[PDB]
Symmetry: C2
Subunit: 337 residues, 2 copies
Amino acid sequence: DTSTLESRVGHYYQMEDTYLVGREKVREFARAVQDYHPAHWNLATAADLGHPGLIAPLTFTSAPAMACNQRMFESVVVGYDMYLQTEEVFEQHRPIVEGDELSIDIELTSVRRIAGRDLITVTNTFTDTAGEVVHTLHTTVVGITAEDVDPAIRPAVQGVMMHGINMLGVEETNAPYEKTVRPEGELRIAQGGATRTPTSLNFDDLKVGEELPVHTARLSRGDLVNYAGVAGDANPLHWDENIAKLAGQPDVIAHGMLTMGLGAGFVSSWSGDPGAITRYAVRLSQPAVVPAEGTEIEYSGRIKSLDPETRTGVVIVAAKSGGRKIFGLATATIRFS
Amino acid sequence: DTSTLESRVGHYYQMEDTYLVGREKVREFARAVQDYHPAHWNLATAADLGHPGLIAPLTFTSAPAMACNQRMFESVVVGYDMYLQTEEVFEQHRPIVEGDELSIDIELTSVRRIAGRDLITVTNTFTDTAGEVVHTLHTTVVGITAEDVDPAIRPAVQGVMMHGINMLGVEETNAPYEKTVRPEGELRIAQGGATRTPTSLNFDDLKVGEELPVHTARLSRGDLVNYAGVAGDANPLHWDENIAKLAGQPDVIAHGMLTMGLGAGFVSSWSGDPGAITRYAVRLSQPAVVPAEGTEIEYSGRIKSLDPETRTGVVIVAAKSGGRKIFGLATATIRFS
């Protein structure tokens, strides 16, 4: 019997179709998170920096993962129709490049009951054509109940939800539920991120406690609408003020993933090499409210630790907006040159 | 002297960067226009249908063209900050396929003063790696003046406009104005669309006057938001109800290009072969209003003419929504089997 969410921990499935990383999509995603690092844009500079093509922004993986995760949240995670992102971890085992063809899987890797609530973590891995895991994504959400929101939210949402169907794996996606687990393991993690020469700041120029310069990002309703289409996030909390209020927010709120992407761009603008960020972990705090006049998010940070053996460091990243703390604890692990 | 819009007719520029057509973007665009023809989705079926990969939906070209056309409408077309799409023509000289790498140019091909108004036509051509024009796009807009709209629209628009910058050709895009024309011609038009074997309906099964079955498309605010990001259209008339009203509309309105894309999918669902539509010409009428509860657009059509020599026909396409006529005269020229 697998009637309970708790009993379904370990549920695993693979997408039948690969995901081909395209050059123009890399640029489009970079644009959507206001990331202008040349490695995401310019072929000649990407080559100068040792890449075989443009590399993806760190949080790019959120877009194909959300598509893959539809069955998990619709059919597998029973008990909830609505979710709130609380935490994300991005592991960049090697930089993803234009022309990568990735096999994506989905695993319900934990369900934890905390303060009457369920914290639900879904893990995706991205495997390349050499059969190596190039990226691991951990998404944690809390389950939201009917009692958390105005009942009027459901007809409102039905009224605005997009209609476009993802025809890929649409049969397997909508099949009846039955439990499946990950086959017996030994996955091979890509080592390229650890062995490549970083194009980041020189390790020896750094000190523990060094502050990153403060960066102000501007965020508008149009940024959110653009991100919704580019990243394939259909949730109207990010563009319908009425529905956002029915959900108990004071106005439209930014995608959690978007504020994380702006944070990754903040880190790579400072460090110099998007490919050198091997881990990025963000706990969210308060949502970033985006009114019709627009808002700002201020990113800041400092070096928490340095390791001279591996010439790596950990940076704490902070984000604040409209009088609110947007990030809780957030860190980036970075390889330096 | 080129101070006047009229004197600038013939203005021409090329994008420095090619545009690489990606497999997943083809799928994403198809999804955005609710087009589920297998040639846009399934690799094995696309092969069965004689294609070397997925082919693009007919109106796919609108997305890269809009990016290219930024300089034309911002810096070249002087006198107007705001435009209304009135007419489009798509010429599919051969079907665009995943992996195509296209060189795009931009030409101000006519400015016509009609009833105190300027009808402004901008033509794009898409040239492949064999130096052949595979697609020609003609976009006609009418110039909209400050007096056509509530003055409050400008601060409102400023408040919501997206920030993400297209770094490609950003220097040439923002350079001072100076007139340039198309070099001395002889362009080579791709003949593949004319010589390939169509996978459409058999010509001999058709009759002049035959009605296409009526199709109801559903359109929601979320469809429009998704299209805005997927197609890179930053205009808030398609997702901000306040700004739409300041623009004199009764509510949010659908992208003209989106209603045209739904029309192309309607035609190819009937004809059987998206690649067989060699020309698609649409004059718009009234905008499709999209309220918070959603709406419908009804597509209909009939065979206008048949040519047994080339085994082609012309179909008239009609579209109506919320009590309004959405299309004026609209036709598709189709090769039959």
